[PDB]
Amino acid sequence: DGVGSSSGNWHCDSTWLGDRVITTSTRTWALPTYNNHLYKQISNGTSGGATNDNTYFGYSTPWGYFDFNRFHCHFSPRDWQRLINNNWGFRPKRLSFKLFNIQVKEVTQNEGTKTIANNLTSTIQVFTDSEYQLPYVLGSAHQGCLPPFPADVFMIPQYGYLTLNNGSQAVGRSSFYCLEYFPSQMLRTGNNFQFTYTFEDVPFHSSYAHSQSLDRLMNPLIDQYLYYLSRTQTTGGTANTQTLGFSQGGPNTMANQAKNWLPGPCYRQQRVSTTTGQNNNSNFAWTAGTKYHLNGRNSLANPGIAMATHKDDEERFFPSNGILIFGKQNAARDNADYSDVMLTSEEEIKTTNPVATEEYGIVADNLQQQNTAPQIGTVNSQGALPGMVWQNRDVYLQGPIWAKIPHTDGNFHPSPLMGGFGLKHPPPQILIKNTPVPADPPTTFNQSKLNSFITQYSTGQVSVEIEWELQKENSKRWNPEIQYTSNYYKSTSVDFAVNTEGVYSEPRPIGTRYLTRNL
Amino acid sequence: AHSQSLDRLMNPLIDQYLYYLSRTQTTGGTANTQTLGFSQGGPNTMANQAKNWLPGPCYRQQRVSTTTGQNNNSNFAWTAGTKYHLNGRNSLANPGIAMATHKD
Amino acid sequence: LMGGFGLKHPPPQILIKNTPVPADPPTTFNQSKLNSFITQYSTGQVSVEIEWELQKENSKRWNPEIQYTSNYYKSTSVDFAVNTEGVYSEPRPIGTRYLTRNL
After folding, report:
1. Where are the domains of chain A?
2. Exposed, middle or buried, A256 (CB in 10 Å: 0-12/13-18/19+)?
3. Residues in binding site of C
């Protein structure tokens, strides 16, 4: 461990081993000093235009953190293609993390002439929240993960967290956490850090689409032996009175046939078209948004439970806040135009899950009688019902991987709604910070805490290796399957490559469901 | 007791990389027509941010105050009571599923 | 065709690069990739050793063969040497076919 010796090598690669695939990626990072080495109470109340739905109380810390919860941090576009075109499923098994070739630099500023030099004796601090004692901030789709392109140098995100609040105030139960109250490893240039983690057992992600629908699982050539009420009134001429007629479901009455299952749960969303002219002329994104109510404040159920984005021949429609939306390279942060973002589609699950913008079904609303016509009610919100089967939201090359399952007495189908793997004990948070280096202190004692520090930042490389277990496809389907493919004809540039400017970009979102499977 | 709420599990300092429909109509002047605008959830729009979970189940109950003067002047304990229907007879869902007694 | 040995698995390409060293980053997080780096270059030595197998001549030719030779008479400078300026230069192309062999 010396000043003149590399403390790690560049490991970036992928290797396929039949039923496993191991991804390894390394990136160069930079870490500034955050908050001037201070912890600060942050808050947002109801004053000004601030609405109650956005209030909060918490703290910003001097620490940064590593995040690689994004599939493109591990899979290259080509690897993702290898994965999705040939496997019915996959999931994480274990990972390795390493920090090395650390460099702490100090920057001097005098007469606009700025100079940067090495501070060979400075240290950075690193530690993992192995016992999950800090607010788990990963799994909220935040920016700051390792870049998709290996050659890109990235800046490390600052760590902050929230606790209970009443307006802009804290309450008795509000918690304050100090990260320096954890043991942490201190490294100088020449030292390195690393750890291993094993994923808990979790279901394989379904990287397939059903080639059968719930309502079409019968034999199209045979009648049922079961009968259904088919007639309530006589038909001949005008002397029409009540009667009772029963028939057997068959090939031409599949909608009436007795079945064993029901489509998945439903919470509805308002429909919007990509052809603006077909939309109501008003600003309803929030007012007509599908939300949930929690302790006085409202939140968008975004993207909410998994539902088919649209039905047959309606690709132009989507749930106002029921799909994942990624921006194109350089899309604005606010009010970006439709042509600057990329909408995903969960159309593959029309097969078992209700369409996001329609009713779940119809139920009786009264008791019909000789003098009262039967009335029906539309169900727009439907919770778990015995017999339901459903699919979860798909995952994307540039989407999240896992999320921590909240520590609660109960939960139902703990699959993260944004997509991914729900884990009770997810990869630990890796916090990093530059140790404060005091500038010269006063020459006579003073009780006050020092607030004059040498300006500095650090840089180094980081490696993450993950082993994924694959579930091979076993189909007896005779005809070719749908596959993700690169465009065939000429183009100005190559998709998933760099600019003439050197800017890498991801042209479209790439899902995971190409191969098919029966129900 | 939890010292964090479901709707406040994110990092209050970073934006999401995920977008949400933020505008359905133009704003400038009076020539207001339909459009499509998208934004990234952030520290000041936590209510719009994409999240992974949902609050627990709900069966509702009528609210009553310990300050009698704020209550409707009628005897509604049973008539306005939250109940379940089982084979022709009704029972109070008492206390029923677990829900917070009141808000802030 | 330009001459030489055709190999299915030739000496591998040896790629080298200076690792980017970021200059001080902004003090508040920003998603953009860093584009401000400390200016630098590297230097060092490189060694290459190659073992060549020779095929000796076995001629029964009685008379002397043609040979590559240095010029005999005086000259302003030495061929395949340096200038008065210190510039090395290769005066002519030197082939490989001097000894002879029957068909």
Report:
1. 1-519
2. middle
3. 6
Q: Calculate the CA A343 to chain-centre distance.
A: 14
Residue A108's CB is within 10 A of a number of other CB atoms, namely 11
Do A122 and A435 meet the contact criterion of CB atoms below 8 Å apart?
Answer: yes
Taking contacts as CB-CB distances below 8 angstroms, the residues of chain B near A410 are 56
Asked if A337 contacts B27 with a C-beta cutoff of 8 angstroms, the reply is: no
Residue A174 pairs in a beta bridge with none
Strands A421-423 and A402-404, bridge-based pairing: parallel
Residue B20 has φ and ψ, to the nearest 5°, of -140, 155
CB C74 within 8 A of CB C62: no
Q: How far is C51 from chain B (nearest CA, A)?
A: 57
- DSSP labels for A148-172? SSTT--EEPPEEEEEE--BTTB--T
Centre a 10 Å sphere on the Cβ of residue B100 and count the other Cβ atoms it contains: 9
Strands A40-44 and A421-423: unpaired
CA dist., res. A486 & res. A14, Å (int) = 20
d(CA C24, CA A132): 32
The gap from C-alpha A54 to its chain's centroid, in whole angstroms, comes to: 21
A27 touches chain C (CB under 8 A): no
Resolution of the structure, angstroms: 2.7
DSSP label of C79:
T
B60 contacts: CB under 8 Å, gap ≥ 6: B82
How crowded is residue C87: how many other Cβ atoms within 10 Å of its Cβ? Answer: 7
Number of H helices, E strands in chain B: 0, 4
Q: Is A409 left (phi over 0), alpha (psi -120 to 50) or beta?
A: alpha
Nearest CA in chain B to A140: B10
Residue in B11, B25, B57 closest to A142 by CB:
B11
Q: How many cross-chain Cβ pairs, A to C, lie less than 8 Å apart?
A: 49
**∠ CA(B42), CA(A288), CA(A314), 5° rounding?**
100
Nearest CA to CA, how far is B76 from chain A (Å)? Answer: 24
Binding residues of A: 415, 422
Cα A474 to Cα A88: distance, rounded to the nearest angstrom: 8
Residues 57-86 of B with CB under 8 A from A: 57
Tell me the helix, strand and coil percentages in chain A, rounded to 5: 5, 35, 60
A403 touches chain B (CB under 8 A): yes
Cα-to-chain-centroid distance, residue A62: 26
Whether B15 contacts chain C with CB within 8 A: yes
The answer to whether B12 contacts chain C (CB < 8 Å) is: no
- For residue B56, give how far its alpha carbon lies from the nearest alpha carbon of chain A (Å): 8
Method: X-ray
* CATH number 3.40.50.720 is the correct assignment for the domain at A1-519: no
Bind-site residues of C for AMP: 6
Q: With an 8 Å Cβ cutoff, are A459 and C19 in contact?
A: no
Q: Are A174 and A57 in contact (CB under 8 A)?
A: yes
Q: Taking every pair of C-alpha atoms in chain B, what is the biggest distance, in angstroms? A: 61
For A271, A277, A310, A321, A341, the CA distances from A280, given in Å and listed in that order, are 11, 8, 18, 16, 21
